[PDB]
């Protein structure tokens, strides 16, 4: 489908301006899902496709429904895969700008992976977007250890997963416009001209 693996396939001899690492929502196919794919497209339209590596969080992250109930909102193995990818970006391309994101379970995964990441890796992540953030309430609109200016949380009116519950209703499926417009505009501001 819409998956992207450019951090895995790219050459440390041609590091890009930006690397996006994005985690999909529960039951979404591929490694980007409905929001990661247009978010990556938008960054490639702004900077050129060869100047952005788009990477989804796959492998061990199976976006299983039951893993929402685990304490941080995803599996330990899925969070560790997020960390692994952030570290691969830092090992291959330490001076590339990293931007991160997630939807739904994937926003919990991203938040936990950024919390667990080294000071070096968190410093390289210039911007993060979270859509339908399942730990919005519990993490008070932030990511632990991550400066607020680098974050945007998109929590729709009536998306109760942002309100300390795991109740999934139609507003949870409303983020496509933000993934094509406000969210990439924010990441572009953090990457720079
Ligand atoms: Na690309
Ligand atoms: Na919307």
């Amino acid at each position: 489908g819409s998956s992207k693996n450019e951090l895995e396939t790219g050459s440390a001899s041609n590091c890009p301006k930006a690397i996006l690492i994005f985690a999909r929502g529960s039951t979404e196919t591929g490694n980007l899902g409905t929001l990661g794919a247009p978010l990556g497209d938008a960054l490639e339209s702004r900077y050129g496709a060869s100047n952005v590596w788009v990477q989804g969080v796959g492998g061990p992250y199976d976006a299983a429904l039951g893993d929402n109930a685990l304490p941080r909102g995803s599996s330990a193995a899925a969070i560790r895969e997020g960390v692994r990818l952030l570290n691969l970006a830092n090992s291959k391309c330490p001076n590339s700008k990293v931007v991160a994101g997630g939807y739904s379970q994937g926003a919990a995964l991203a938040a936990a992976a950024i919390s667990d990441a080294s000071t070096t890796v968190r410093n390289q992540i210039v911007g993060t977007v979270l859509f339908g953030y399942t730990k919005n309430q519990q993490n008070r609109g932030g990511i632990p250890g991550y400066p607020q200016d680098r974050l945007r949380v998109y929590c729709a009116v009536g998306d109760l997963v942002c309100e300390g519950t795991l109740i999934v209703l139609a507003p949870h499926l409303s983020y496509g416009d933000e993934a094509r417009n406000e969210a990439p505009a924010f990441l572009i501001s953090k990457i720079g001209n």
Side-chain angles (χ1 to χ4, degrees):
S2 55
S3 297
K4 296 273 283 197
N5 279 266
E6 295 180 321
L7 171 57
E8 291 289 355
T9 64
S11 180
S13 298
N14 285 292
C15 288
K17 179 177 194 86
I19 301 166
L20 172 62
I21 293 162
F22 192 86
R24 78 198 184 273
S26 304
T27 81
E28 295 200 298
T29 59
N31 71 1
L32 290 175
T34 60
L35 303 187
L39 182 63
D41 287 345
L43 297 183
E44 292 185 340
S45 291
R46 170 66 177 76
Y47 294 114
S50 298
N51 298 315
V52 179
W53 292 350
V54 181
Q55 179 69 47
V57 182
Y61 180 38
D62 37 27
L65 285 165
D67 290 351
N68 289 282
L70 296 170
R72 312 174 80 187
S74 190
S75 76
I79 293 164
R80 277 200 311 278
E81 181 69 355
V83 172
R84 191 182 71 76
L85 292 168
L86 293 168
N87 274 265
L88 179 61
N90 191 72
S91 70
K92 243 177 209 191
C93 295
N95 297 109
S96 293
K97 309 222 163 137
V98 171
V99 290
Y103 171 46
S104 205
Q105 175 175 179
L109 190 167
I114 291 169
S115 298
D116 288 355
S118 66
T119 306
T120 294
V121 167
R122 258 193 313 280
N123 188 56
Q124 181 179 16
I125 311 169
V126 298
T128 297
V129 293
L130 303 178
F131 301 95
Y133 179 33
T134 55
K135 299 297 184 186
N136 185 59
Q137 190 82 317
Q138 296 94 329
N139 283 343
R140 291 192 47 84
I143 300 175
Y146 193 65
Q148 198 67 18
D149 77 273
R150 299 186 184 207
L151 182 61
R152 287 294 180 281
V153 176
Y154 302 95
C155 272
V157 165
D159 187 355
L160 300 185
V161 310
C162 293
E163 308 190 4
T165 81
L166 284 168
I167 300 165
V168 176
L169 298 175
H172 194 59
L173 308 188
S174 72
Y175 300 109
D177 48 296
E178 291 90 345
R180 286 175 174 77
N181 294 281
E182 295 86 351
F186 173 70
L187 293 185
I188 290 162
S189 77
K190 295 296 165 178
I191 292 159
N193 172 62

